[PDB]
Amino acid sequence: LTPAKVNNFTLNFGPQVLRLVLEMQGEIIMRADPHIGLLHRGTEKLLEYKTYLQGLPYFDRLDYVSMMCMEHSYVLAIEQLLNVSVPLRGQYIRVLFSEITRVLNHLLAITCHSMDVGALTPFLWAFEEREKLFEFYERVSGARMHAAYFRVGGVSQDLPIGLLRDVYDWARQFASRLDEMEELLTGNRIWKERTVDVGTITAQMAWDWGCSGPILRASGIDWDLRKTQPYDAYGKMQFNVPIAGHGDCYDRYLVRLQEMRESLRIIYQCLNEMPDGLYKSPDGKVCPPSRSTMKQSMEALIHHFKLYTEGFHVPAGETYRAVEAPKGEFGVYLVSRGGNRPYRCKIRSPGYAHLQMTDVISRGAMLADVVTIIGTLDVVFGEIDR
C-alpha cells in the first residue's frame, strides 16, 4: 500500500544499545523513529518456568541502576495475593534502602546526563559516593548490585551491627557533596542554554503520554505514590515534594536534585526511628525459618525442604501493584492460577513509556538535543526491553 519513491534524506543514528532513525529537512528534526528490542531477553516467558523465589533475581536485572525498588513491587504483588503483613522493622529497612537506591539512580542519571552534555567532573565525583553506597549494599547482602535482599514477608537478613553508624556518617557529608556538585552546572549559563526550554512537555500531554516520576513533577503536577498511595512506612515519613512548571530539562534537573534532598531527609528520619523487633513475617509456611531453627526442629526442616524445592502456592487470582520508582512508576501485573509458579507476570516500565515521547518531543529540535532528550528521559533499556 506504500511505495518508497523519494529516498532523499537518510540517516542512521547508532547501532551502539539504542538504534535511532531520524528525519530532518536540514538542521532541524522533523521525525524520529527509535527501534528497540536489542535487549529484549524474553524474561516474561522465562518467568513462567521459575518459582516465585526462583524468578526474584530476574527483577534485579530489569533496572540494574535501581534494584530494590524493582524487587519491592513484585514482592508486594505476591504478598497482597498472599494476604501477608510485613513487620515494622522490615518496612523501615525497605524504605531506607529504597531511598538509598533512589539516591544512586538520581546520581548516576544526572552524571550521565552531564557527561552527554559535556561535564565530566560530576560523573567522577558522584561515583565515589556511589561506591560508598555499593559498599553499604555489599555489607548487607554480599552483592554490589544484584542483592536479592527483599523477600516475601520481609528481607533475607537483618542489618549487620555498625551499619547505621556509617550511614549517618555518609549522610553527614552527602549534602556537601551535592552542594559542590551543583556549583558546576547550577550557576552556569552554558548548562542552562543547553538545557533550558529543550523538550517542553505539558501536563495534558504527559498524562496522555503516561509520564511518571520526576518528569511528571516538573509540569506543575502534585503527585507522589508515596503520598497518594503509600506503601510500607512511607505514610509515616514527612518530606516535601519539589514542583516545577515549565517541563524543561533544567527543570527536571532541579527536580531530581530536590528529590535527592528529600531522599536524604527520609534517610535521616528512618535512621533516627529504627525499631527493634522481627524482620521477617512469622509465617513459616511462606517465609523460610532460621537455620538454627531448621537444624533443631522437624517442622522448620520440613518447611525449609518444601519451600526451597516447591515453594508456597499462591491462591488463584490477579493483582497489579506499582512502586514510585526513581525513573517513574514501576508496576508488575501478576496472574495466579493456584500453583507454585506465577501463571503470567507482565512488567510495566516507566522508561518504556517515556521513550515513546521522542518523536513528538524531538520535533523542532536539533541533533545536539537528541542526546539531551535521551539523557533527560532517564531510560534503562533493561526495563524497556524485557
| Contact residues: ligand SF4, CB under 6 A | 61, 64
d(CA 384, CA 386): 6
Gap sites in the chain (C to N > 2.5 Å), preceding residue numbers? 16
Q: CA 291, CA 262: separation in Å to the nearest integer?
A: 38
With binding defined as CB under 8 A, does residue 41 bind another protein?
A: yes
- By beta-carbon proximity to another protein, the closer residue of 25 and 278 is 278
Nearest distance in Å: CB 138, ligand SF4? 14
287 binds, among another protein, ligand SF4, none (CB under 5 to 8 A by kind): none
Q: Which does 71 bind (CB under 5 to 8 A by kind): ligand SF4, another protein, none?
A: none
3-state secondary structure of 332: strand
Minimum CB separation of residue 150 from another protein in Å reads: 13
Nearest distance from residue 348's CB to another protein, in Å? 5
Q: Which is nearer to another protein, 32 or 314 (CB)?
A: 314
Quote the crossing angle between the two packed helices 249-271 and 163-182, to the nearest 10°: 160
Site for another protein in 236-295 (CB under 8 A): 238, 240-241, 243, 254, 261, 264-265, 268, 271-272, 274, 276-278, 282, 288-295
Name which of residues 132 to 151 contact another protein (CB under 8 A).
134-135, 138-146, 148
Q: Work out how close the CB of 135 gets to ligand SF4 at its nearest, in angstroms, rounded to a whole number.
A: 18
Residues 174-203 that bind another protein (CB under 8 A): 175-180, 182-198, 202-203
What, of another protein, ligand SF4, none, does residue 52 touch, CB below 5 to 8 Å by kind? Answer: none
# chain residues binding another protein, by CB under 8 A = 188
Identify what 194 binds: another protein, ligand SF4, none; CB under 5 to 8 Å per kind.
another protein
CB of 179 to another protein, least distance (A): 6
344 counts as binding another protein under rule CB under 8 A: yes
Give which of 128, 143, 138 is closest to 174, Cα–Cα: 128
User: Contacts from 170-175 at CB under 8 Å and sequence distance 24+?
Assistant: 170/129, 170/132, 170/133, 170/136, 171/264, 171/267, 171/268, 171/271, 174/103, 174/129, 174/264, 175/261, 175/264
Least distance between ligand SF4 and beta carbon 61 (Å): 4
3-class state of residue 280 by DSSP: strand
143 binds, among another protein, ligand SF4, none (CB under 5 to 8 A by kind): another protein
Number of alpha carbons in the 13 Å side-chain half-sphere of residue 142: 4
Question: How close are the terminal C-alpha atoms of the chain, in Å?
Answer: 32
Please say whether the beta carbons of 60 and 101 come within 8 A.
Answer: no
Q: Could you say which of 25, 208, 302, 363 contacts another protein (CB under 8 A)?
A: 208
- Least Å distance, CB 64 to ligand SF4, is 6
- Alpha-carbon distance of 309 to 307, in angstroms, equals 5
Give the whole-angstrom CA distance, residue 329 versus residue 354.
Answer: 11
Between CA 246 and CA 230 the distance in angstroms is 27
Residue window 77-116: x/- pattern of binding to another protein, with contact defined by CB under 8 A? ---xx--------------------------x-----x--
d(CA 354, CA 360): 11
